[PDB]
Structure formats: structure tokens, C-alpha cells
Amino acid sequence: SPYGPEARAELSSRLTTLRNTLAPATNDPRYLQACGGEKLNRFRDIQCRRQTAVRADLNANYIQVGNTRTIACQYPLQSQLESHFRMLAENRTPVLAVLASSSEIANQRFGMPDYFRQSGTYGSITVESKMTQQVGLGDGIMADMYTLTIREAGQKTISVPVVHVGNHPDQTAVSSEVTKALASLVDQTAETKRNMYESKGSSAVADDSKLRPVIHCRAGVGRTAQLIGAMCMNDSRNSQLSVEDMVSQMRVQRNGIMVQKDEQLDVLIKLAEGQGRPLLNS
């Protein structure tokens, strides 16, 4: 019963209502608005909650799901790269997880700059990319890892671990098993890097807004939300957090599209069922 079709229908009913409520109005005070004529949102109806926005010129949000703190963002536009790199450096980012595939990044029509696999200079910021490990996630899906070193006069140099799901399938969801493996890899990578900062006495450790994993796909609402949900289920502090809670939290803190597809919700439901975690709030 707790994971039966009736419970799943009720979950979808609650979530659909929330999506509708959170739909952006014109000049919605709840959502970040572009400054002038420069494009902010990669997709016109996938907007950035203002109160949790990370930077005034990015579509990127702080999200806390239960106890689990992350940043979810869209794939930066070319015009946003310098700001995106500054975000990454100022956050002392312990892991950047990119869930857009190599083939999507290569598709010029999609406007997704290859910013983490090559080196470059973006305004005042110079970035160096180095390849590190490759970790299999299951079903032939591979996580390619990098270190991204971000340099800028007047700023401390910051190196960011990157986990790129290079062969993420382009038109299907990845399984719960792959998602679990990915969540574990992302969390572990973050823990190692965060620990380094703690060992150096970084002031970022005391700042709730910093040391957050940064996750994006293309729009930052589909694959990204599936991963963040899996990460929150991988957090030992989150006992009794329901699927309703986690998706509601993602939606209120970013936008009502978080967990964009039923296919993605199916994976979160399966993960929750495996843990005996509730779907709904009583």
C-alpha cells in the first residue's frame, strides 16, 4: 500500500498542485529577473527562485533537502561563464557534477560551452582542466573526473573536482542503481575535498552558503533533481524525510519543474521504497 498506485497517484497530485502554484508570473517577485536584455534563463519557463539565488546573474539556487545542502543550476550560458567560475571558486566547491553528456555539449545548437574539459580565459579568470579518474556507475555509464583550477588576480586560486557523466543517455533516465552509484561518488568526492579545506582551517567551513556540491545538467531540473534526491537519501541525517518533502523542498527552493519528468520521480520512488522511506506526509 505505501508504495502502491494509490499512494503514487496521491504523491503526483500533491506535486502537480505545487508545480502549478510555483509557475512564474511576469516579473514574479519570487523569481530572479534578468538585468536588461542579457539572457538569464536558458529556458524561458525554467526560472531561478530569488530568495535562494546564488548570484544575481546566474540561474542557480541554494537547495537544502532535509539536512543535505547543495547548489542546483542550469548549464551556464557562454555569457555567464566568468560569473559561474567565480561562483565555483567563492563556494570552495567540493564537487561539480555535470550530467549533460559529451554529445549534448558537442551539439552547438544547445549552447553548452565545454568549460570544464578544456582550459581557457574568461574575462579576468583563467581556468586549467586536468583529467583524473574514471569511475564506472553501472550499465556502461562512466563518470569522467577532472580537476578544474580557477585563477584570478586578487582571488585565492581554487581547484574544483568535477564528476562528468560523459555518456549519460540523451533521451532516457538512468536507473536507480546508476543513480545511487553516482550519488555515492559525488558525495565521496565532496567529502574528500571538504576535509582538505577543514584541515587547512578554511573559514568556508563555518559558512552555510559555502562548500556546497554544485550539480547541473542542461536546465538543472531533471537529471539534476534526480541526483539531488538520491544524495539526500544517501545522507544519514535524513531519516523520515519523505519523497513528498524532498521534491517539495527542491521545488520551493529552485522552481516548480524540479523533478521534471515522471521517469525521474519513478527512480526516486524506487530508491525510497528500498529504504522503507515514506512517499507521503501524514
For strand 141-151 and strand 125-138, is the pairing parallel, antiparallel, or unpaired?
antiparallel
Dist CA 263 CA 47 (whole Å): 22
* Extended strands (E) in 49-152: 60-65, 68-73, 96-98, 120-122, 125-138, 141-151
| Beta carbons of 246 and 239 less than 8 angstroms apart | no
**DSSP 3-state percent helix, strand, coil across the chain (nearest 5):** 35, 20, 45
Count of Cβ atoms closer than 10 Å to residue 22 Cβ: 20
Q: What is the CA angle 31-262-67, rounded to 5?
A: 60
Which one of 35, 48, 73, 217 is the catalytic residue? 217
Region of 238 (left: φ > 0; alpha: ψ -120 to 50; beta: rest) is alpha
Beta bridge partners of 149: 128, 159
Torsional sign, CA 18, 24, 25, 31: positive
Dist CA 133 CA 163 (whole Å): 9
Nearest to 125 by CA among 156, 82, 158: 82
Torsional sign, CA 50, 51, 56, 58: negative
Dist CA 167 CA 102 (whole Å): 6
Dist CA 96 CA 212 (whole Å): 9
- Count Cβ atoms within 10 A of the Cβ of residue 50 and give its class: 0-12 exposed, 13-18 middle, 19 or more buried: middle
Structural domain harbouring 208: 1-282
Torsion over CA of 45, 51, 56 and 60, rounded to 10 degrees? -60
3-state secondary structure of 250: helix
| Beta carbons of 32 and 47 less than 8 angstroms apart | yes
Amino acid at 245: D
232 is annotated as an active-site residue: no
* Extended strands (E) in 118-253: 120-122, 125-138, 141-151, 158-165, 214-216
CA 74 vs CA 2, 61, 97, 218, 276: distances in Å: 34, 9, 12, 6, 32
Nearest to 229 by CA among 281, 172, 267, 190: 267
- Count Cβ atoms within 10 A of the Cβ of residue 189 and give its class: 0-12 exposed, 13-18 middle, 19 or more buried: buried
CA 148 vs CA 29, 151, 184, 185, 211: distances in Å: 35, 10, 21, 17, 16
CATH number at residue 50: 3.90.190.10
Resolution as reported, in Å: 1.2
- Cell of residue 215, nine digits: 550539480
User: What total number of domains does the chain contain?
Assistant: 1
Beta bridge partners of 49: 31
| Beta carbons of 273 and 234 less than 8 angstroms apart | no
